[PDB]
Design a protein around this motif. Structure first.
Motif, PDB file in Angstrom:
ATOM      1  N   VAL D  64       0.823  -1.203   0.000  1.00  0.00           N
ATOM      2  CA  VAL D  64       0.000   0.000   0.000  1.00  0.00           C
ATOM      3  C   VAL D  64       0.868   1.269   0.000  1.00  0.00           C
ATOM      4  O   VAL D  64       0.401   2.367  -0.330  1.00  0.00           O
ATOM      5  CB  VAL D  64      -0.958  -0.038   1.201  1.00  0.00           C
ATOM      6  CG1 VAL D  64      -0.215   0.235   2.508  1.00  0.00           C
ATOM      7  CG2 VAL D  64      -2.115   0.936   1.035  1.00  0.00           C
ATOM      8  N   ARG D  65       2.147   1.138   0.369  1.00  0.00           N
ATOM      9  CA  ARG D  65       3.029   2.295   0.402  1.00  0.00           C
ATOM     10  C   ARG D  65       3.235   2.854  -1.003  1.00  0.00           C
ATOM     11  O   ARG D  65       3.464   4.051  -1.170  1.00  0.00           O
ATOM     12  CB  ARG D  65       4.371   1.983   1.065  1.00  0.00           C
ATOM     13  CG  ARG D  65       4.284   1.743   2.569  1.00  0.00           C
ATOM     14  CD  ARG D  65       5.490   0.979   3.079  1.00  0.00           C
ATOM     15  NE  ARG D  65       5.439   0.826   4.537  1.00  0.00           N
ATOM     16  CZ  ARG D  65       5.737   1.776   5.419  1.00  0.00           C
ATOM     17  NH1 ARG D  65       6.130   2.982   5.041  1.00  0.00           N
ATOM     18  NH2 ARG D  65       5.607   1.537   6.710  1.00  0.00           N
ATOM     19  N   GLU D  67       1.550   4.001  -4.083  1.00  0.00           N
ATOM     20  CA  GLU D  67       0.219   4.562  -4.263  1.00  0.00           C
ATOM     21  C   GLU D  67      -0.404   4.090  -5.570  1.00  0.00           C
ATOM     22  O   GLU D  67      -1.603   4.264  -5.782  1.00  0.00           O
ATOM     23  CB  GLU D  67       0.313   6.082  -4.115  1.00  0.00           C
ATOM     24  CG  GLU D  67       0.720   6.477  -2.697  1.00  0.00           C
ATOM     25  CD  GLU D  67       0.930   7.964  -2.448  1.00  0.00           C
ATOM     26  OE1 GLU D  67       0.610   8.843  -3.288  1.00  0.00           O
ATOM     27  OE2 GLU D  67       1.472   8.247  -1.352  1.00  0.00           O
ATOM     28  N   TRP D 170      -1.702   3.082   8.421  1.00  0.00           N
ATOM     29  CA  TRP D 170      -1.539   3.822   7.180  1.00  0.00           C
ATOM     30  C   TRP D 170      -1.962   5.284   7.372  1.00  0.00           C
ATOM     31  O   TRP D 170      -1.282   6.197   6.898  1.00  0.00           O
ATOM     32  CB  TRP D 170      -2.315   3.092   6.069  1.00  0.00           C
ATOM     33  CG  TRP D 170      -2.546   3.850   4.788  1.00  0.00           C
ATOM     34  CD1 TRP D 170      -1.682   4.025   3.742  1.00  0.00           C
ATOM     35  CD2 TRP D 170      -3.777   4.488   4.394  1.00  0.00           C
ATOM     36  NE1 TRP D 170      -2.285   4.735   2.734  1.00  0.00           N
ATOM     37  CE2 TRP D 170      -3.563   5.045   3.110  1.00  0.00           C
ATOM     38  CE3 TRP D 170      -5.026   4.653   4.996  1.00  0.00           C
ATOM     39  CZ2 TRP D 170      -4.559   5.740   2.425  1.00  0.00           C
ATOM     40  CZ3 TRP D 170      -6.012   5.339   4.319  1.00  0.00           C
ATOM     41  CH2 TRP D 170      -5.783   5.867   3.048  1.00  0.00           C
ATOM     42  N   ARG D 173       0.618   7.572   8.899  1.00  0.00           N
ATOM     43  CA  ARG D 173       1.690   8.029   8.028  1.00  0.00           C
ATOM     44  C   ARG D 173       1.201   9.075   7.026  1.00  0.00           C
ATOM     45  O   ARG D 173       1.954   9.454   6.142  1.00  0.00           O
ATOM     46  CB  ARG D 173       2.305   6.858   7.255  1.00  0.00           C
ATOM     47  CG  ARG D 173       2.881   5.745   8.114  1.00  0.00           C
ATOM     48  CD  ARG D 173       3.737   4.801   7.267  1.00  0.00           C
ATOM     49  NE  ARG D 173       3.022   4.257   6.104  1.00  0.00           N
ATOM     50  CZ  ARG D 173       2.255   3.175   6.101  1.00  0.00           C
ATOM     51  NH1 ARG D 173       2.139   2.453   7.203  1.00  0.00           N
ATOM     52  NH2 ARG D 173       1.603   2.801   5.006  1.00  0.00           N
ATOM     53  N   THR D 174      -0.042   9.553   7.144  1.00  0.00           N
ATOM     54  CA  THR D 174      -0.605  10.447   6.144  1.00  0.00           C
ATOM     55  C   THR D 174       0.273  11.688   6.006  1.00  0.00           C
ATOM     56  O   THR D 174       0.532  12.359   6.993  1.00  0.00           O
ATOM     57  CB  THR D 174      -2.022  10.864   6.538  1.00  0.00           C
ATOM     58  OG1 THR D 174      -2.822   9.690   6.604  1.00  0.00           O
ATOM     59  CG2 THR D 174      -2.616  11.840   5.538  1.00  0.00           C
ATOM     60  N   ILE D 255      -7.153  13.967   5.086  1.00  0.00           N
ATOM     61  CA  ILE D 255      -7.702  13.437   3.850  1.00  0.00           C
ATOM     62  C   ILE D 255      -9.085  14.041   3.585  1.00  0.00           C
ATOM     63  O   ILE D 255      -9.381  14.390   2.446  1.00  0.00           O
ATOM     64  CB  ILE D 255      -7.711  11.894   3.877  1.00  0.00           C
ATOM     65  CG1 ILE D 255      -6.285  11.339   3.945  1.00  0.00           C
ATOM     66  CG2 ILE D 255      -8.475  11.318   2.672  1.00  0.00           C
ATOM     67  CD1 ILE D 255      -6.202   9.863   4.286  1.00  0.00           C
ATOM     68  N   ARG D 263      -3.269  13.436  -4.583  1.00  0.00           N
ATOM     69  CA  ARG D 263      -2.812  12.320  -3.773  1.00  0.00           C
ATOM     70  C   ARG D 263      -3.869  11.833  -2.782  1.00  0.00           C
ATOM     71  O   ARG D 263      -3.745  10.717  -2.297  1.00  0.00           O
ATOM     72  CB  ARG D 263      -1.520  12.637  -3.006  1.00  0.00           C
ATOM     73  CG  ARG D 263      -0.305  12.432  -3.902  1.00  0.00           C
ATOM     74  CD  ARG D 263       1.014  12.651  -3.187  1.00  0.00           C
ATOM     75  NE  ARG D 263       1.341  11.524  -2.314  1.00  0.00           N
ATOM     76  CZ  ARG D 263       2.197  11.587  -1.287  1.00  0.00           C
ATOM     77  NH1 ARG D 263       2.705  12.732  -0.908  1.00  0.00           N
ATOM     78  NH2 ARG D 263       2.520  10.506  -0.617  1.00  0.00           N
ATOM     79  N   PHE D 264      -4.885  12.654  -2.480  1.00  0.00           N
ATOM     80  CA  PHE D 264      -5.891  12.300  -1.489  1.00  0.00           C
ATOM     81  C   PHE D 264      -7.207  11.855  -2.118  1.00  0.00           C
ATOM     82  O   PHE D 264      -8.103  11.421  -1.401  1.00  0.00           O
ATOM     83  CB  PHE D 264      -6.090  13.496  -0.552  1.00  0.00           C
ATOM     84  CG  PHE D 264      -4.966  13.726   0.455  1.00  0.00           C
ATOM     85  CD1 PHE D 264      -4.083  12.705   0.809  1.00  0.00           C
ATOM     86  CD2 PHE D 264      -4.790  14.970   1.060  1.00  0.00           C
ATOM     87  CE1 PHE D 264      -3.074  12.919   1.746  1.00  0.00           C
ATOM     88  CE2 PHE D 264      -3.786  15.177   1.997  1.00  0.00           C
ATOM     89  CZ  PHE D 264      -2.933  14.148   2.342  1.00  0.00           C
ATOM     90  N   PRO D 267      -7.520   7.900  -1.710  1.00  0.00           N
ATOM     91  CA  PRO D 267      -7.660   7.767  -0.257  1.00  0.00           C
ATOM     92  C   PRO D 267      -9.006   8.204   0.327  1.00  0.00           C
ATOM     93  O   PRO D 267      -9.573   7.514   1.177  1.00  0.00           O
ATOM     94  CB  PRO D 267      -6.503   8.624   0.246  1.00  0.00           C
ATOM     95  CG  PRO D 267      -5.427   8.400  -0.809  1.00  0.00           C
ATOM     96  CD  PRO D 267      -6.217   8.483  -2.103  1.00  0.00           C
TER      97      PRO D 267
HETATM   98  C1  LIG Z   1       4.054   6.459   1.165  1.00  0.00           C
HETATM   99  C2  LIG Z   1       2.642   6.343   1.723  1.00  0.00           C
HETATM  100  N1  LIG Z   1       1.753   5.798   0.652  1.00  0.00           N
HETATM  101  C3  LIG Z   1       2.185   7.743   2.209  1.00  0.00           C
HETATM  102  C4  LIG Z   1       0.812   7.763   2.813  1.00  0.00           C
HETATM  103  C5  LIG Z   1       0.412   7.201   3.989  1.00  0.00           C
HETATM  104  N2  LIG Z   1      -0.914   7.454   4.219  1.00  0.00           N
HETATM  105  C6  LIG Z   1      -1.415   8.198   3.186  1.00  0.00           C
HETATM  106  C7  LIG Z   1      -2.699   8.699   2.979  1.00  0.00           C
HETATM  107  C8  LIG Z   1      -2.908   9.426   1.831  1.00  0.00           C
HETATM  108  C9  LIG Z   1      -1.881   9.656   0.908  1.00  0.00           C
HETATM  109  C10 LIG Z   1      -0.614   9.155   1.108  1.00  0.00           C
HETATM  110  C11 LIG Z   1      -0.358   8.412   2.268  1.00  0.00           C
HETATM  111  C12 LIG Z   1       2.655   5.322   2.881  1.00  0.00           C
HETATM  112  O1  LIG Z   1       3.398   5.584   3.854  1.00  0.00           O
HETATM  113  O2  LIG Z   1       1.906   4.322   2.773  1.00  0.00           O
END
Ligand SMILES: C[C@](N)(Cc1c[nH]c2ccccc12)C(=O)O
Ligand code: HEM
Ligand code: HEM
Ligand code: HEM
Ligand code: HEM
Ligand SMILES: c1ccc2c(-c3ccc4c(c3)nnn4CC3CCNCC3)c[nH]c2c1
Ligand SMILES: c1ccc2c(-c3ccc4c(c3)nnn4CC3CCNCC3)c[nH]c2c1
Ligand SMILES: c1ccc2c(-c3ccc4c(c3)nnn4CC3CCNCC3)c[nH]c2c1
Ligand SMILES: c1ccc2c(-c3ccc4c(c3)nnn4CC3CCNCC3)c[nH]c2c1
Ligand SMILES: C[C@](N)(Cc1c[nH]c2ccccc12)C(=O)O
Ligand SMILES: C[C@](N)(Cc1c[nH]c2ccccc12)C(=O)O
Ligand SMILES: C[C@](N)(Cc1c[nH]c2ccccc12)C(=O)O
Lengths: 352, 353, 341, 345
Positions: D64-65, D67, D170, D173-174, D255, D263-264, D267
């Motif tokens: 999931v890291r 994207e 997850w 880490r946003t 988010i 990027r959001f 998500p």
């Molecule tokens: C690199 C990453 N995908 C960063 C991340 C984490 N949570 C998120 C929520 C929305 C957008 C991006 C992220 C990760 O650490 O999974």
């Protein structure tokens, strides 16, 4: 001659959309969806009222006595449940509006609310929600919110005979209850008493065992439940508390129809009973889906400092189920062989 | 203070029900259902037009170029398909009216028809149904019914940029098609040519047999199909006939999005393409459910003049009315995944947010 | 003690999922969805067969003659249409699989096909699809695709009495058709003749008039055609109709006198038979649209051919709408005779 | 060559229907419907588990890291909700069985019950329903009814990382939460404080209308400022009234507020989909209740009343995502995200 738009008065229907966001110089796109969704609910509420009123009238004016009219009755009540199902599904459209987007125009609506739907109240009243059984919101009667001709209409809706009352009267006349006739209640009591006796003997005969213990306990519960049916005083008490709604005699009629549903004269009546339960279940489903959406949009504590969410949650209850007695007849099911026999000998009055 | 009924203008909406049966001294109960059902359809058509116009505008005025607006675009197109699904289910209500009961008030409606729904036509036009592809009813143009401002509105609806045209223009700008850049088309042609060559050799090695012939024949079909994709002239010809709708370059953009859907910049674009196909499918489903009901109510022969309504409507359930047919037909050009030109991070910088 | 999983034989149902992609060393996630979706269709086809066979038996063994059994008959036919509606909606699940993802495991399926659903064929046959009226697949009969006991079962399904045939026989006995009795057909012909005559005279008393003349002519031809037994027999031969002329009379009797107590539940049955035909067609249509989305522009064209009146078994029930008349033309039924219904 | 029936193992699926009524010499027609309906539910539960496990794995294995994988994640979660919708509609089939007809074979089922569905429990556990939060039926733990490998599976289902826990990590880490970075929380607190100040002045500048606005302001103020009480959150977490860590809650709100940022976008769809699954699970439970009522009555610890109790926030795993609606502010209070500070998004 006649043109589609004129026939449907689209000059009214499609010129009834005014965004308050726009009227106040800040148009919000999703407000349009909010307006249309409610207008569509209101059109269908009008249709439900039209079907329901026509059926009330068939009962109230004596037409239902002619069994030729039963097909129309059941077909219209079935139609009401088909519309209600669509209305439940229709929440899926408003769920495409996020809470964030709702929040951009919510302020321009205040202090209007769905609570002020005349038609929804008319519908509740005409089906037979009892005023004393309503849950108050902010310690007030629901009708206090209405004035003028609207208040007048709501009063009529409360004072005129409800579908519950009209079905009650008709159930009381159900064929087969006559003591001088098939004497359903007398025979039923006798057969249940005998059936319980037989069952007791069977269980007592079993070898001492955990299974036996359980069966004994079960028998005792079932015995109490089934015999309680013949206690007319208990019924009156439960009627007083609002846990039941139908008269004792109407309840007898309903059970007659349930047990003898296959007999030709009871086939369509049974469908009617099924349909009344369907409407109650779908009204509750409407209320439930409405609650979940209010929660998603406003949170668990927002409302007029009463939580709207919590008041609405309180409406999702047997308190608002008018034909709750029809559901509860399941409690009094017996083995088929205990049901008083209706041989051709006596099977003459239930043929068409 | 604002009240519910005033805010929703219920003095209009709930005073718009006049039974012609009753106006002519012979009220028929089920006529009320017929009126309400249509009025509910029209409210939702208005909502669909409102969403669709807002999306057209986002494309037409360049807002779509800022990819921050893609969520709104896809959410509104998804909303249109959610409404359309409700509209398909809504036929279940009118199916509770029997043909015999319809027959008791049908005479008082003549000569009105659903055919005269301005909004339905506006919706067809704005999505991108071509006038020259429409099937005539009783050898007549669809617009012949309409006059005055209504005819004017319909003409604007035909002349203004359709959703199809606006999506086309945006597809033509899809990143990755630049020959000086990722050169999607060139690499794709090369990989497909090579892939076919390799396959042919494998097949040829086999011993003469019925099976081999079948394999050979299949290969030849697949070869023709895949290579046909690179024939720009055939595309132009099919565009002329109306068998295709998107420009060759837009088709390239669509396939780029299809093949690289997982790449971040293409994820929501892919959902949009999916949503456009959904709308086409649901519009067709609406037409089909409408046909089945007309049949039940009027029979297979009843219709204006000697023409059968039933048969004309059946004719509308056709690719002729499918605006995004090219998006569906991209499934025809699926290849093994390993033939798809690779997009390593090195050459991926362009598809990151 | 009976346990849920044992009662439902979940040791069978939930150990019936084998991905061919995985068996060949290249597991594809979406293959699992494809398997489950079809297994769920097949469970429901089994249920439909169970209901339909029970109803066929009620007709075939004479139980339907006792009208006490009509509620059960209509309740089971209504149940079939409720299941079919779920089966139509169920396509929405398989639509969450993209064509690109399907394409990753499609090769491992060859040469199996939905065409080989025994139960779907049994269902078509038991309702009353005629084998001679089927559209050929690859220039050949559908049954050629089946072998052994399965071919045998399909033959039985064709030779045993279909729902159509059993309903037909019951319709032929509909009360009211007796010439010595209520004489429905005779009275109907007479009333339609008179009704048309009356209308013509009114018409004879303008552009509008021309139109009304045209309408009258069409209506007249259509309504009078109903009394042409020879045309019916011809159309039966061509397969454009399915019910006997007498059964058609029975159905129209039920339609016109549906409110009469003995006809109320029979009318619901007729309504339900049309519903099943409509929902079967809708299943076929939704299936076509999905095949198209998955495979592109052909099985597609064969399937499109199945979405036709050719596969509508109760097409005669639908077409009775063509022969609707004003209510006042319907032969009157009063206590004098009313009691018979 | 592979044949349809063999590929689908129909020799198993279509030979799994045994009516207990018939086994005991008294076949009841409707029993067949009861069996098929449940078998169809179980097939779909298997499919839901397969999707949900695949998504858990994408989180748990670090995929999931990248994207690139968000489309697959959201597509599978959307698929789960489409199946759940069908499962809700599927009750309409069993509703064609009357209570009277059910009563003719009910005795042959005893003492089996849907309560013993292994897969339903596995699904509840894997989404993240907490054992300590479950309502007891007849003063019993839900697992007491399971034994052997089944009990083992249920244990693993409780011990392994739930969807809730994986989403939580997850969310923590946003991007945007870094104090050295966009400093979302700091800016938000500041803007809300200022916004309230400004509104108060308007109120002071001004009756019952004013008084109402005064009261409203007080409620809104309490609610909004309560968001910044980390200690209250930890307390509510302890009680089980909330489920996400404070940091994950911050990620979710980031988010929510910046959903349109590229990027959001997906998500945000994921968060929406998690709420949808909770809503649909509850809808399943509610439709189940209504049916049990019609079939057994309100008395037959009543099953009806226990089931009604399951329609509660107690069983809502992503309740925190729903409750973020409570903390909506005017758009202009939201910390601005200029392209300058957008590069990260
Ligand atoms: C690199 C990453 N995908 C960063 C991340 C984490 N949570 C998120 C929520 C929305 C957008 C991006 C992220 C990760 O650490 O999974
Ligand atoms: C954004 C969507 C919605 C929100 C936020 C919402 C909010 C509310 C709230 C808070 C109440 C409680 C009364 C109050 O505090 O004012 C209420 C009641 C009500 N709403 Fe809604 N509502 C929504 C959608 C709808 C829709 C689509 C209908 C359709 C007509 C509707 C009809 C009603 C009705 C009839 C009541 C009174 C119910 C009763 O007293 O039992 N609402 N709504
Ligand atoms: C009793 C139900 C219905 C009947 C009998 C019916 C009949 C017809 C007929 C015969 C036509 C062909 C035009 C003609 O001959 O005049 C038609 C077209 C149409 N109907 Fe219906 N209809 C019904 C319900 C509806 C509903 C509910 C809608 C919803 C708006 C609708 C919308 C339309 C539209 C838009 C057309 C034109 C479609 C096209 O040209 O492709 N109808 N209808
Ligand atoms: C990816 C999804 C699907 C594809 C691509 C597909 C493809 C096809 C194709 C091409 C045919 C034509 C016969 C042939 O050439 O093999 C066919 C027929 C058929 N399919 Fe499907 N199908 C799909 C899903 C389903 C599902 C879910 C069912 C459920 C049982 C099903 C049942 C059937 C049946 C019964 C036939 C024979 C229909 C007839 O002869 O009228 N299919 N399918
Ligand atoms: C005749 C229809 C049904 C009846 C009367 C019924 C009855 C009940 C009752 C009384 C319970 C409470 C536990 C108990 O007393 O044994 C229960 C729980 C349950 N039922 Fe059903 N049920 C029916 C249909 C279904 C169906 C179709 C499903 C689908 C799989 C199902 C799944 C469950 C599950 C999973 C539970 C446990 C739920 C929980 O613990 O939250 N039931 N049922
Ligand atoms: C038309 C107009 C409004 C509504 C609503 C409705 C009901 C309550 C609402 C709301 C919208 N937005 N916020 N609230 C909460 C109240 C609480 C007291 N202070 C004012 C806001 C539903 N349907 C409608 C149709
Ligand atoms: C409003 C008003 C009418 C309609 C119809 C509609 C369309 C065609 C119809 C009809 C109703 N009833 N009969 N026909 C066929 C014509 C054929 C020519 N002769 C007169 C009858 C659908 N939606 C509507 C909304
Ligand atoms: C189990 C196994 C396969 C299927 C199919 C099915 C049917 C036709 C298919 C297919 C899958 N993949 N490609 N085709 C096209 C064929 C058509 C005949 N000529 C060769 C290509 C549907 N349900 C199934 C269940
Ligand atoms: C398979 C087998 C049984 C079920 C049931 C189920 C649940 C509770 C039932 C029932 C069937 N019949 N009667 N009851 C009431 C019991 C409850 C406990 N106390 C004794 C009476 C649902 N799904 C099933 C699947
Ligand atoms: C003559 C009658 N229709 C008798 C009646 C009353 N309730 C019923 C219920 C089922 C069947 C018949 C009835 C009447 O008195 O209305
Ligand atoms: C800058 C740009 N948004 C590029 C663009 C065009 N089509 C696309 C499809 C998918 C992804 C991106 C694009 C535009 O020109 O609109
Ligand atoms: C006695 C009878 N049940 C008569 C009959 C036949 N078809 C019908 C249709 C509607 C109403 C009654 C009938 C029988 O012969 O089955």
């Amino acid at each position: 001659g006649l043109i589609y738009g004129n026939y449907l008065h689209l000059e009214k229907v499609l010129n009834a959309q005014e965004l308050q966001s726009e009227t106040k110089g800040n148009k919000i796109h999703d407000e349009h969806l909010f307006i249309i969704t409610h207008q569509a609910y209101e059109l269908w509420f009008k249709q439900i009222l039209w079907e329901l009123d026509s059926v009330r009238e068939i009962f109230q004016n004596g037409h239902v006595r002619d069994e030729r009219n039963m097909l129309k009755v059941v077909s219209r009540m079935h139609r009401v449940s088909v519309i209600l199902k669509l209305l439940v599904q229709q929440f899926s459209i408003l769920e495409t509006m996020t809470a964030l987007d709702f929040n951009d125009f919510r302020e321009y609506l205040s202090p209007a609310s769905g609570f002020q739907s005349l038609q929804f109240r008319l519908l509740e009243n005409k089906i037979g929600v009892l005023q004393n059984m309503r849950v108050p919101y902010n310690r007030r009667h629901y009708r206090d919110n209405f004035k003028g001709e609207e208040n007048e209409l709501l009063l009529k809706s409360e004072q005129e005979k409800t579908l519950l009352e009209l079905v009650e009267a008709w159930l009381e006349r159900t064929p087969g209850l006559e003591p001088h006739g098939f004497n359903f209640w007398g025979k039923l009591e006798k057969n249940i008493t005998r059936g319980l006796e037989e069952e007791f003997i069977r269980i007592q005969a079993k070898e001492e065992s955990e299974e036996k213990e359980e069966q004994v306990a079960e028998f005792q519960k079932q015995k109490e439940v089934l015999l309680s049916l013949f206690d007319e005083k208990r019924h009156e008490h439960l009627l007083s508390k609002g846990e039941r709604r139908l008269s004792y005699r109407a309840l007898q009629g309903a059970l007659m129809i349930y047990f003898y549903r296959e007999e030709p004269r009871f086939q369509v009546p049974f469908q009617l009973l099924t349909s009344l339960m369907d409407i109650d279940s779908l009204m509750t489903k409407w209320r439930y889906n409405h609650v979940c959406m209010v929660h998603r949009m406003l949170g668990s504590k927002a409302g007029t400092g009463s939580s709207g969410y919590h008041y609405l949650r309180s409406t999702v209850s047997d308190r608002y189920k008018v034909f709750v007695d029809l559901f509860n007849l399941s409690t009094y099911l017996i083995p088929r062989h205990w049901i008083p026999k209706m041989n051709p000998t006596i099977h003459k009055f239930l043929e068409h």
